[PDB]
Amino acid sequence: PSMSITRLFPALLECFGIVLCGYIAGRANVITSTQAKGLGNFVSRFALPALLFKNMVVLNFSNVDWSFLYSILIAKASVFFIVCVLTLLVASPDSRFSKAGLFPIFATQSNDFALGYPIVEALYQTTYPEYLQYIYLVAPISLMMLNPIGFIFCEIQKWKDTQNASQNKIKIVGLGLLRVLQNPIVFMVFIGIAFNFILDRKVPVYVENFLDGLGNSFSGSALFYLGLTMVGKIKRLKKSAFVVLILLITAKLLVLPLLCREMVELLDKGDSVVNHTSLSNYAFLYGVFPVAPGVAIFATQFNMEVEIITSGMVISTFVSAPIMYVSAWLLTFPTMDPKPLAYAIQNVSFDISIVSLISLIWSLAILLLSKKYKQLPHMLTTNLLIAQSIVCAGMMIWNFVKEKNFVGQILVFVLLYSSLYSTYLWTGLLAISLFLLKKRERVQIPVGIIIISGWGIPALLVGVLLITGKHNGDSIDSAFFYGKEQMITTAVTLFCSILIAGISLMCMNQTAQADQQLTRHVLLCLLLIIGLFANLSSCLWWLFNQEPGRLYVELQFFCAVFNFGQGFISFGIFGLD
Ligand SMILES: O=C(O)Cc1c[nH]c2ccccc12
C-alpha cells in the first residue's frame, strides 16, 4: 500500500502498552515520586531536546514540503480561532479567559513526539520518509504560532484576577510569549535550526551517537512518564465539564483532522493523485494525535483549570487509539481492490479481536471473581461476555484457519458465527430479561431457558446454515462463507434480536411510565442495538442490493468494528469497576 498500515496495530499497541505499563507501575507503587520527577526531568530536559536537536540539524529545509506545513498550520490556526472565539462567546464572563487560553491550545496542540512520531514512523518510514520530518516542523511552529495567543489569554486571566488589573498589555503579551520561548520544544528548535547552518546539516559523529542514545529513548520514556502522570488524574468531572470536554475532544480528534485533510486538499497542488492522497491522508492522521501533555503542564503552571485539561489530556490519549486505528484503515480502503479489501477487513477484525478479547477476559474475570455472575440480570451478561469472547477467539482462530483445511474452516466458522449470532440474540435476551426484572410482579426469570435460547437458537441457525447453504471455500470474509444463506440467516438473527430488544426496551420504558444495575444493562443493550442496526444494514444492503456502493465498504468496516469490538462496550460498562 501507500502506507504500511499493517504496522499500525503493533505500533499502537507498543505505544499504548507502554502508557498502560506506566499507569500500572504508577498505581502499583513500583516507582517513587522522586523517581517520577527524575523521569520527568530526563524526558523533558534531555531526551526531548536531544530528539529535536538531532532532527533539526539533520533536516534538509530546501526540500521540505512547505505546502503540508502551511496546511496543518492553517488548520490548527482555524481550530484555534474557532475554539477561541466559541469559548469567549460561550463561557462565564469572569473565568472565560483561562478557558479561552487553554482550551484552543488543548484543541490544537498534540502529543506529536511521544506517540505521533512512533506511529508515523510505523506507517511511513518505508513508504514516505519525508513525512517523519513534518512532525518536527509542525508541532514546534504550531506551538510558537498558537500557544502564545492562548498563553496571552491565560495571562489576561491572571492579570484580571490579580487585583491590580491595570498593568501594561505589553507585559501581558511578553510574559505569554516568554513561556513559549522557554518551552524546550521551541527553545531547542531555534537552537537546532541555527546548528543546521553552522554544521551544514552534518552532526559530528560523536555528537550523533550521543544524541541518538538520548533522543531515541524519548519515545518510550515519554510514554512511560505519561503513564505515571495519569495516576488518578482523571478526577471525576462535573457533568457540565464533561460536556465541554466531549466538544473539545471532538475538536482535537475529529474537527482538526477533517479540517487538516480539507486544508491539504485545498493547498496542495502537486503532480500526482497518489502523492496528493497520501499527503491528504497523512494530514488526517496528524489531526488525530492526542492532546500534548505539555498542555496539562501549562494549566498547572497557570494554576488554572487543571481538572478539565488533565482529565481531557488523559481521556484524549486513550480515545486517540480507537480513532487512529479506525481512521487510518478507513482512509486506506478507497484505494484497495475488492480482494485486497476483504483481506483488509479481516486484518481489522483480527486486531480488534485481540484487544477486545483481552478486555473481555478482564471483564469476565471481574464478573466471575466478583461472583456477581450469579445475580439474575448479570448471569445473562456473563453469558453474553462468553459469547463475545468466543466471537473474538473464533475470529483470531479464523484468520489463520481460512488458509488451512476445509474441515477446520467449517468447524471454526460454526464456532465463530454461532457465537456471533449468540451475541446478537443475547442483546435481545438481555433486554427481555431486564424487562422481566422491571415487570417485577413476575417469578424468577427462566434462566435455564434464556441461556438455552441465547446459545441453542444460534446453534440451530448455524446448523440450518450448514444444511441449507452452500460453501464458498474461496471466500476471505467469514460473513459470506455460506453465501446468500449466510447473510439471510444473519439478517434474520439480527432482525429477531432487534425486534426483541426494541420491543423489550420500549416495554421497559412503558412500565416505568406507571444490584440489578438496570441503567448499565440498558446502556449495554442500547449501544449493542446501535451495532445490531449497523449489521442489519450491512446484511440488508448486500441482500436487497446487488452492488456494494462505496458506503457498503465503510459500513462493512464498522460492522467488523462492532462485531469484534463489542467486548469494549461490555468492558466499558462492567470491566472498569
Ligand atoms: O507534550 C508534548 O507534546 C511532549 C511532551 C513533553 N513532555 C512530555 C512528557 C510525557 C509525554 C510527552 C511529553
Put residue 165 in one of left, alpha, beta given phi > 0 → left and psi -120 to 50 → alpha: left
Shared-domain flag, residues 300 and 344: no
For residues 501-510, one letter each, b for 16 or more C-beta atoms within 10 angstroms of the residue's C-beta and e for the rest, the string is bbebbeebee
State how far the Cα of 521 lies from the Cα of 531, in Å rounded to an integer. Answer: 15
Q: Which protein residue has the closest C-alpha to ligand 1 atom 6?
A: 294
State how far the Cα of 489 lies from the Cα of 331, in Å rounded to an integer. Answer: 31
Neighbours of 519 (CB within 10 A): 11
Q: Is-contact 447 472, C-beta < 8 A?
A: no
Shared-domain flag, residues 343 and 303: no
State how far the Cα of 105 lies from the Cα of 302, in Å rounded to an integer. Answer: 13
Neighbours of 91 (CB within 10 A): 16
Note down the domain range covering 472: 338-575
Q: Is-contact 497 532, C-beta < 8 A?
A: yes
SS3 of residue 110 by DSSP: strand
- CA torsion through residues 108, 114, 118, 121, sign: positive
The verdict on whether residue 482 carries a ligand-binding annotation is no
Shared-domain flag, residues 281 and 395: no
**Structure resolution in Å?**
3.0
Cell of 340: 485486497
Q: Is-contact 499 471, C-beta < 8 A?
A: no
| CA of residue 292 to ligand 1 center, whole Å | 6
| CA of residue 284 to ligand 1 center, whole Å | 21
Number of domains into which the chain is organized: 2
Q: Is-contact 475 481, C-beta < 8 A?
A: yes
State how far the Cα of 524 lies from the Cα of 423, in Å rounded to an integer. Answer: 12
Given ligand 1 and candidates 113, 187, 233, 314, which is best to mutate, with the most ligand atoms within 8 Å of its CB?
A: 113
Shared-domain flag, residues 311 and 394: no
| CA of residue 260 to ligand 1 center, whole Å | 22
State which ligand 1 atom lies nearest to the alpha carbon of 229.
10
Shared-domain flag, residues 360 and 326: no
Shared-domain flag, residues 255 and 320: yes
Report the C-alpha dihedral over residues 110, 116, 117, 123, rounded to 10 degrees: -150
Domain closes at, from 306, 335, 364:
335
Q: At residue 350, what are phi and psi to the nearest 5 degrees?
A: -60, -45
Shared-domain flag, residues 312 and 382: no
**317 Cβ neighbours under 8 A, 6+ residues apart:** 19, 111, 226, 230, 290, 291
Of 89, 183, 94, 105, which is closest to residue 142 (Cα–Cα)?
A: 105
- Which amino acids bring their CB within 6 angstroms of ligand 1? 43-44, 48, 111-114, 222, 225-226, 292-294
| CA of residue 331 to ligand 1 center, whole Å | 28
The verdict on whether residue 439 carries a ligand-binding annotation is no
Q: Which protein residue has the closest C-alpha to ligand 1 atom 11?
A: 222
SS3 of residue 179 by DSSP: helix
Q: Cell match 483532522: residue?
A: 257
Domain closes at, from 293, 308, 335:
335
Domain closes at, from 318, 335, 352:
335
State how far the Cα of 251 lies from the Cα of 319, in Å rounded to an integer. Answer: 13
| CA of residue 201 to ligand 1 center, whole Å | 26
Shared-domain flag, residues 357 and 330: no
Shared-domain flag, residues 271 and 418: no
CATH code for the domain of 494: 1.20.1070.10
The verdict on whether residue 23 carries a ligand-binding annotation is yes
Neighbours of 545 (CB within 10 A): 10
Shared-domain flag, residues 290 and 422: no
CATH code for the domain of 163: 1.20.1530.20
Q: Cell match 507501575: residue?
A: 25
Query: Which contiguous run of DSSP H or E holds residue 261?
Result: helix 256-267
Helix-strand-coil split of the chain, %, nearest 5: 80, 0, 20
Shared-domain flag, residues 331 and 410: no
Given ligand 1 and candidates 183, 221, 225, 233, which is best to mutate, with the most ligand atoms within 8 Å of its CB?
A: 225
Method by which the model was determined: cryo-EM
Shared-domain flag, residues 366 and 217: no
| CA of residue 550 to ligand 1 center, whole Å | 39
